Structure formats: structure tokens, C-alpha cells
Design a protein around this ligand. Structure first.
Ligand SMILES: CC1(C)N=C(N)N=C(N)N1c1ccc(Cl)cc1
Ligand SMILES: CC1(C)N=C(N)N=C(N)N1c1ccc(Cl)cc1
Lengths: 519, 520
């Protein structure tokens, strides 16, 4: 009665259409890959690179299991090129594209039966092209069990990977160039050039390129590596702003001695279409905290212990007996933050006593109101909620930072604008971009709409002084493609969603910033 | 109300006093840029002389002849004044300001042919012991501003040079240059407009608003000549025009329940400088400043009775205050024009229970404006200095929810900046109005807190162009924005709530004329 009931279209608006993937290829100085899939210029260093890349999982501790492993999609001819005795490629799900062969067919091609069953799990045939394979890998059985998908070969498989719609799911291209001169490469590999129609809006850029290396295979073969990624202009908005703040921001010092460089007034835009999730890649975002806290906000929770008991300690400091008493909130039990955030969202203006009270039906439930409006009159220009309540600020452990959000609808897509008065560019902003992206996605799922864009307006945007050096280190990283968000299951009510109901896939953030802590 | 009211500080006027008055420049050059072989001018092109005469003499809005209460001023070097035949001195219908380090105003008078002439022109002549800068400073005084409509620098290689470099060049609103094809007339002093991107231009980008076709003088040598009007590119107004254009070309079309159509985009942001008295009133379409000012003052006093506005000829709330509209909102108990706890009420009495507009609300609710004013004076770096009228609890009781619903302040180097959040923005008439309102508010708050006006950042939520405004808006998009006007205060007050529209004046506002055709 007080909860928000999810429509029957709850799962259809965010169903992953195609799984994201990477492409791995070896070419010669002329762009040629080979004829019917040749390899006579076999460079042991490349084979090992290929093996490590496609087999290893990110979790530097995890070993490939049917529950968590990488996938390799290949054309039939590529599968045939593999010595029958060495099929399938171990430690990976072998997805073979074929319009004649079948899963059993591929299986029997393998000699001994001891493995004709030990690998019955590691092989699957797809009657179609790359797109169908990615569509299949997008199903519950493979996503998220499959950590990363690698398109490994076939001139026709690469060509489909490099054109729409598949290219929009291409996270990276790993190209090895063997400087061996052979003409036995009837087909060439071409990465769409920046700004051309074939590129379909994507700007391919090298993240890395090695120096010229020499093989230890006797031929002294010259070869080098390249990692190409689709330029992420959205994350560059955030980096450009950080750099501008450090270069031109005003330095200020807290009454406690804390310093910051800052600018006033900025705005950034992020797409939420097709399951895209704007989790910054140049520095890992604590997604689990983001998700737990957001759900916490939606349920109009005010007791920080619920978050603390989940390993999310972002409210510890402002939830202690000391801090609370410093605010004159002596009757508040520790971790009881008062009518903050989510409380104003679901109960704007409701009198607060203790987090223990039952606030059902109290105050103005702005979220419920926006949900109903979105479903009946999406063009309404008053669809916004705020936590900024001058009358309740004194009763809060702390005044809200992200205090206002407005929704907008166009062509069945739901867009959201968030206003944040104070923005810690280092830790907070990436976190908050994630929260509202998640919020927008959930609201879309509650209103029969598709997630659109997240607009982020910043007031006082700052970088802490003793964050400058580590921030400069991060500013050196070229943003990678964003990950995607999928839901394992749905719920009857919005307030019933749990962090375990959704999963973030294909998130490959850069390593932690080496903030030389000592030594 | 005294303690209920906001007392202004002793520096109230200090950081708002006009330092230098804006001005235009008119000059004639030969095909090489030379203005004169030294001090003389071997070319008397009749048509140029007339243009100069008309341009510097006329006022805006025809049918208004110059008078000591409203006229333009011409600023010239001493040698230029001397080049004028004593009989035509001073140039009629204009305040003649002469730069001289040796001649006083009386000395200038003594130079007129007779006494009668001196008494008749004593009020139209003034000497200033200094350069153009000192003249612009004097012209910024209460005696001359707003009295003098437009200031025109009219000559002297020395005066032009000073006009074209900082600090004076930042007050130059337009350059009117006449180019004449002089034959073998090699001069010495060259008039050159600083190129875009050069150190000399000081960040200003001079562009042609207009350029005439090549003309032929009726004089004796049929001298060829042409005119140009150059203005400092206004990137700030271009923000607005670019957004409008993008909305028309790419916005989403929508029609409400009434059948009212709009094109819209979601999420935008613009910036406007308020430094050194600059007021961002759009020039490509005249803005109703008196209405902006009366309403803003009305907001600040925490008013809710629209009749106070309509009685002053400001009818922007008539439709939303009518018995019929109030009743459509279920506000049947409200007196007509009593809007309920809207805007200013929430600004000065957030959360207070509302009955009627004539009730006494002193001390009730949270006075957000007063709190911010105090914080700005003692802890300017605080990051919680913002006020809002978006009160979900009171919305049902309002004639309608607020459009500009939140504003945050920021301080840097003694400069006050303000960010405004507007959920719904009518680009055609509403946005220019709003930009001016918050520019005014920021300036007033700056004056009440011992700070200098800084920047106004405007965040737009749903930004739309009405379907009925498309064609006219397209006409407006043709126009190249002109330099913005300025705001000056003719008097100060003891309290913020005491300010009246007549205490301030917009000067040097030169908007384009109404857009051709009607119906929409
Ligand atoms: C080892 C090789 C040639 N090298 C790269 N860079 N990429 C591939 N996809 N390869 C490849 C791997 C397996 C198969 Cl079956 C075919 C080609
Ligand atoms: C008429 C003339 C030559 N023409 C232009 N364009 N500008 C001036 N400033 N002029 C001018 C006017 C008066 C004086 Cl005393 C000197 C020059």
C-alpha cells in the first residue's frame, strides 16, 4: 500500500540485448590475417599472449571454472584449424559459429571420450553470426558467469565485429603485428578510421603499443602489440574538470586546516542506454556501496547501521555518539542520522523522533508521486524530488550534498538531472554518478520506460589538496569503455530490490593509484 | 521590522559604484588606416560629416530631441576641439567634454567669440584634466549618469589609442568607422582595431555588425567611401542563441492537454559575468527590466500578493492570480491575486503555515535569505549557502510550483557568484527575464554582504521554445548580439527590503528593435 509496485514490463526495459566483448587478432605488416585461417608465421610469444589474455580472469586469485570463466567466439573454419587433439581451447567456453555443425558434432570430432565428456561443458555451437553469439552470451546462463568474451578469429567474424550493431559492444581490440613478409593473407584487418561513416561514431584509439620485439623462435621475427579502445568522451568530461580544478581552481582552507582547490558550476552528461553503466574506469568505484546506499535511500531509511552491517561504512563518522551530540542530537541512538536523504524523499516534512518509528504514509512521498506521474503524464515539468528541507536540516546529522533530482521523458526514454551543492571530485562524484544512474534505471523499470541520460550539475566542485598528486596520476589514464548493468531477477515492489538482484558486467577499471604509502 | 529586515553594511555602495562609463567611438580613416597627416584632415566628405552629426546627436526612440536632461556626449582631445571653428563651438545638442592638461572649463568658455555665447553654452562644455579614462570616470558620476545617454569618443589619435587599450577598451560598446579612398593622402597616425587572439585585443573579439556598400561622395572628387559598425563579440548572449537554435533544430516536439506545443531539450547551463556593473540583459530582444526589477524586489520582501505588482503596471502574474485560475487549483479561499506561499514567502519564511497574504509572518518559518547574508559575511567558503522555494509540503497551497526553485552562492577573491536551478524554462520570454532577475539578486546580495558581484550560472532543466514562437525566434537568431548594458544605483537603503526600482538604473542598453510581423 505504501510500497511502489513494479509493472509487468519491469524486466523488458533493461534486458541485455547483446553481451559486450573484446577482439583478439594477429596480423602482418600489411594488415593480412591469413587465408582459410593460416598460422605458419607462428610466433610463440603471441600464442602465449593470446593464451594468457583469453584464459585468465581479473580476480588475481580465481581459476577458470564453469561458474566463472572467459569465452572465445570463433568461426567454424577457425575451430577446424585447431588440431583435433588440442580442441577445445582449455579453460574457456568455446563458442563456434556454424550453420551445419552442432554441439554434438563438434564434440565427436574429438579423439578420446574421456574428454568427450570432460569438455561436454566447454563447447557450444551457434547457428548464426557473431551477433547471435553475443545475443546468446547475453542470456542468464552465460551472463555474468562469463567474465569476458573474446572474438578470436575468422575474417568474416572480425568483419561483423567491426560493423554495427556488434561494434557498439566492442570494448577493446588486441592486435599483434608480425613483421614477417608473406602474402598468404587474402583478407585484411581494418579498424574503422575516426570520423568515417564506417566508424559509426566510434573513435578508436591506442591505449598501448609495445616497442618492436624479437621472437625466440629462430627466425628473429619482428613483432609488436597494440591495444585499441573506443574513446570514452563521457569519462573525459570528468577528467577534464578535475584537471581544470587542479590547474585553475581557487585554493581554500577549512576552519580545521583542510585545503581544497575549487571551481563553481559545472555540468556533465552520461548515457544509460542499452544497459550502459557510467562507472568510471580510471579509478575503481565502490559499486556495492553505491547500490546498497541507493536502495537504502529508496526505502527511506535513516539508520546507518543497516549499511554498516553490510560492510558499507560511508556513514560511520557522521553516525557516532560524538558527532551526533556535537549537533545537539542527543536523543538519537548511534547511527541514527535523523530525517536525512531517503527520508525526505519518501516522507518530506514528516516529524522525526527515532529511526524506529513507523513512517508509512507520513509526509510527502515524492518518489511515489513521480512514479505515478511518469506513467500517466510523462511530459509533466514538475517531476522532481528534493532532500533540501530548511525546516529539517537542524535535525539531520548532516545536510544533503546531492539534494535535488528532476526527471524528463522523450521517445520512451527516462532522463534525470541531479543537482549537487558540494562535490568531492576525487571520491564522491564518481560514487554519485553511479547512484543516480542506478536510480534512473530503477525508476525507468518502475514506469515502463527505457533508461536515457543522467545529467549531473555541480555547485562547489573541489579536489582536496592532499589528493592533487594521486589525482594527477589518474589524469594520465585514458578512460576505457564503460561496463553494463543487468538484473539477475526482478521484484514485485521497488523497495524489495537487493544488491544481489543486479550485476555489473565487463567492468575493467585501471589498477589502484600507487600512492607510495612508504618503503 | 528592523531585525526582521536585512540591514545593509556601510560598504553598501562601495562595491557597486560605476568606475568608468561605457562609450562608443566614431572615426574616419583613409584606405591605410591613417586618421590625419598629424592633426589636420584634408578630406571633408559631406556624407561622413552628416553621419557623424546624426549618430552623435540623436537619442534612442525617435521623437525625443536632445536636452540638458537627456543628451549624448562627445569626448575629444584639446587639439580636436581647437580644430572646430570658434563659431561652431561647441557642437550643438551634445555635452562637449574636452581633454586638456592646460585648459580649464572656464578657459574653454573664454575661447568662445562672445559673452552671450558663453552663458548660453556654459552647461554644454566641460574640460577634464586628464586622458579619456579620467573623462569616462567623470561621466560615471551622478551628475552625468544616467543623464548622458551615450558617450562618443570623437577624435585625436591620442584619444583613440587610449580607447583601444585596457582599461578603456573594455567599456567600448561599438566602433563606427568610415573608410575613405583618399588620394595620395599619406598621414602618420594609424587607427587599427586589435585583431582577435592578439595580446593587444585583450580577449576582445571585434566583429562587424554592419558594413555599407561602397558609396560615392557627391563632393568634388567623387570620393569613394563606406561605413562599418564594429562591436565586441558577446559570447555570453551567444550561449542563449545557440541553445535556442539547437532546441528548434533538434528539440523534441510535445503538445500538452491544452494543445500547447513546444520543442524541448533537457539539461543545459550558461554563465554570465556581473563584474564591474555589467548586467546581462539580452540585446537581440529587449527585456522588460522594470518588470524584472519590481518582481525581484517583491520576491525579496517575501510578498505573495500579486496586486502589488499589477498596481505598478507589472501584469506577469495576472493569469496565475485570477479567481478562475485560483479556483482551478482548489484555492477557493484565496483573495484574487493572492498566490499563496509562493517564491519569496518560502525564501523568507520557509515552512511557515499560510492563511492569507495580509497576515503577519514576521519571524515565522526559516528566513533563508537572512541566514545566507550572515554566512556570507562570516564564513564565505561555507558550502551550504543556498535557498529554495521547492517545498513539497506547501506546493498544493501555491498558485503554481516555482520554476526557478533553487539558488546557491559561492565566494572567491571577494566576488559573489550565484547558481540558479530552473526546472522549466521558456527560452523565448521567460529565460531572458530570469537571467536578469538572478543577476539583480546576486548584485543586491553582494551589496548586503560587503562583496563584489561575480558570476551568474544558470542551470536549465526542461528548456523549451513554444511552437508559436518558432518563426519569430528564428528571426531573432539572425541578429548578432551587442555588448551588454550596465546597472548603477542612484541611491542606497538602510535595509534590503527598502530598495525600490527607482533606486537603480540600466544604462547603455541598446537592444535591437521589435521583430517584424505579429500574431505570434
Ligand atoms: C594466436 C593468434 C594467431 N594471435 C592472435 N593475436 N589472435 C588470435 N585470435 N590468434 C588465434 C588464436 C586461436 C585461433 Cl584458433 C586462431 C587465431
Ligand atoms: C566627422 C568625422 C571626420 N567623421 C568621423 N567618422 N568621425 C569623426 N570623429 N569626425 C570628426 C568629428 C568632429 C571632429 Cl571635431 C573631428 C572629427
Amino acid at each position: 500500500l505504501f510500497k511502489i509496485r513494479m509493472p509487468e514490463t519491469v524486466a523488458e526495459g533493461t534486458r541485455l540485448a547483446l553481451r559486450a566483448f573484446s577482439l583478439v587478432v594477429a596480423v602482418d605488416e600489411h594488415g593480412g590475417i591469413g587465408d582459410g585461417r593460416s598460422i605458419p608465421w607462428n610466433v610463440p610469444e603471441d600464442m602465449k599472449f593470446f593464451r594468457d589474455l583469453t584464459t585468465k580472469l581479473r580476480g588475481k586469485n580465481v581459476k577458470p571454472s564453469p561458474a566463472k570463466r572467459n569465452a572465445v567466439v570463433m568461426g567454424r573454419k577457425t575451430w577446424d584449424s585447431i588440431p583435433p587433439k588440442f580442441r577445445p581451447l582449455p579453460g574457456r567456453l568455446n563458442v563456434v559459429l556454424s550453420s551445419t555443425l552442432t554441439t554434438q558434432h563438434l564434440l565427436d570430432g574429438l579423439p578420446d571420450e574421456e574428454k568427450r565428456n570432460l569438455h561436454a561443458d566447454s563447447i557450444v555451437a551457434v547457428n548464426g553470426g557473431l551477433e547471435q553469439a553475443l545475443r546468446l552470451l547475453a542470456s542468464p546462463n552465460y551472463t555474468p558467469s562469463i567474465e569476458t568474451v573474446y572474438c578470436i578469429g575468422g575474417g568474416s567474424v572480425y568483419a561483423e565485429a567491426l560493423r554495427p550493431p556488434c561494434v557498439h559492444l566492442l570494448q577493446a581490440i588486441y592486435r599483434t603485428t608480425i613483421r614477417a613478409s608473406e602474402s598468404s593473407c587474402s583478407v585484411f584487418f581494418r579498424v574503422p578510421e575516426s570520423g568515417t561513416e564506417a566508424a559509426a561514431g566510434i573513435e578508436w584509439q591506442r591505449e598501448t603499443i609495445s616497442e618492436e620485439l624479437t621472437s625466440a623462435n629462430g627466425n628473429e621475427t619482428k613483432y609488436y602489440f597494440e591495444k585499441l579502445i573506443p574513446r570514452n568522451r563521457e569519462e573525459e568530461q570528468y577528467l577534464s574538470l578535475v584537471d581544470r580544478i587542479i590547474r585553475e581552481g581557487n585554493v581554500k582552507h577549512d576552519r580545521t586546516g583542510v585545503g581544497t582547490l575549487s571551481i563553481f558550476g559545472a555540468q556533465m552528461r552520461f548515457s544509460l542506454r542499452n544497459n550502459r553503466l557510467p562507472l568510471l574506469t580510471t579509478k575503481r568505484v565502490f559499486w556495492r556501496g553505491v547500490c546498497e546506499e541507493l536502495l537504502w535511500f529508496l526505502r527511506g531509511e535513516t539508520y546507518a547501521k543497516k549499511l554498516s552491517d553490510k560492510g558499507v561504512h560511508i556513514w560511520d563518522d557522521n553516525g557516532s555518539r560524538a558527532f551526533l551530540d556535537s549537533r545537539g542530537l542527543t536523543e538519537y541512538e548511534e547511527m541514527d542520522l535523523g530525517p536525512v536523504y531517503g527520508f525526505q524523499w519518501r516522507h518530506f516534512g514528516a516529524a522525526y523522533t527515532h529511526h524506529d518509528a513507523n513512517y508509512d504514509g507520513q509526509g510527502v512521498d515524492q518518489i511515489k508521486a513521480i512514479v505515478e506521474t511518469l506513467k500517466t503524464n510523462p511530459d509533466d515539468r514538475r517531476m522532481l524530488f528534493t532532500a533540501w528541507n530548511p525546516s529539517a536540516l537542524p535535525r539531520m546529522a548532516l545536510p544533503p550534498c546531492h539534494l535535488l533530482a528532476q526527471f524528463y521523458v522523450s521517445n520512451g526514454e527516462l532522463s534525470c538531472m541531479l543537482y549537487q551543492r558540494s562535490c568531492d571530485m576525487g571520491l564522491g562524484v564518481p560514487f554519485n554518478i553511479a547512484s543516480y544512474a542506478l536510480l534512473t534505471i530503477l525508476i525507468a523499470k518502475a514506469t515502463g520506460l527505457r533508461p536515457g541520460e543522467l545529467v549531473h550539475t555541480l555547485g562547489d566542485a573541489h579536489v582536496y589538496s592532499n589528493h592533487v598528486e594521486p589525482c594527477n596520476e589518474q589524469l594520465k589514464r585514458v578512460p576505457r569503455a564503460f561496463p553494463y548493468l543487468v538484473f539477475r531477477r526482478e521484484r514485485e515492489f521497488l523497495e524489495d530490490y537487493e544488491e544481489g538482484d543486479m550485476e555489473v558486467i565487463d567492468y575493467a577499471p585501471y589498477p589502484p593509484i600507487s600512492m607510495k604509502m612508504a618503503v
